[PDB]
């Protein structure tokens, strides 16, 4: 997209750095910063725990630009067919990250922003409404934060 100001992006870097240092001490820049950090911790632990059990998931999908959407939709639809919970939401994120890593391994990085949009839209329409009614983002931070 078009170029923003130098100052907007210098701000964004400063805030990222300061958010990180604040969270290291039990503080937070914002509810967003607290969620980002808890989610990164969560995905690391989920992957440390359980990747050995589905380590060839993204590989068996045989991803290509033409089949990527259908493969993403199939996994994500199955992942939540019998319901939503916090652990499956974490898995939804780990899976999208693995699918992006897989896409770059296969020299298909045009898929990374695509996966990002598909995830954002799914979060928006199918996950946040469950999140709202099950304690909100604060409950996720309470359950997965500082871990």
């Amino acid at each position: 997209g078009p170029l923003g100001s130098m100052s907007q992006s210098n701000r964004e870097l400063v805030v990222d750095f300061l958010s990180y240092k604040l969270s290291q001490k039990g503080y937070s820049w914002s509810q967003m910063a607290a969620v980002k950090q808890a989610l990164r911790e969560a995905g690391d632990e989920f992957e440390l725990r359980y990747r050995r059990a589905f380590s060839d998931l993204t590989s068996q999908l045989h991803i290509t630009p033409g089949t990527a959407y259908q493969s993403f939709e199939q996994v994500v639809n199955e992942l939540f067919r019998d319901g939503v919970n916090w652990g499956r939401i974490v898995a939804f994120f780990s899976f999208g990250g693995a699918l992006c890593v897989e896409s770059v391994d296969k020299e298909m990085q045009v898929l990374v922003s695509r996966i990002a949009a598909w995830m954002a839209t799914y979060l928006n329409d199918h996950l946040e409404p469950w999140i709202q009614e099950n304690g909100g983002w604060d409950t996720f931070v309470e359950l997965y934060g500082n871990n």
Partner: peptide, 15 residues
């Protein structure tokens, strides 16, 4: 498959 893996092993991580 690595569905009903990324299934029980999400569920196992639910708090």
């Amino acid at each position: 498959x690595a569905x009903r893996x990324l299934x029980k092993x999400g569920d196992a991580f639910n708090r």
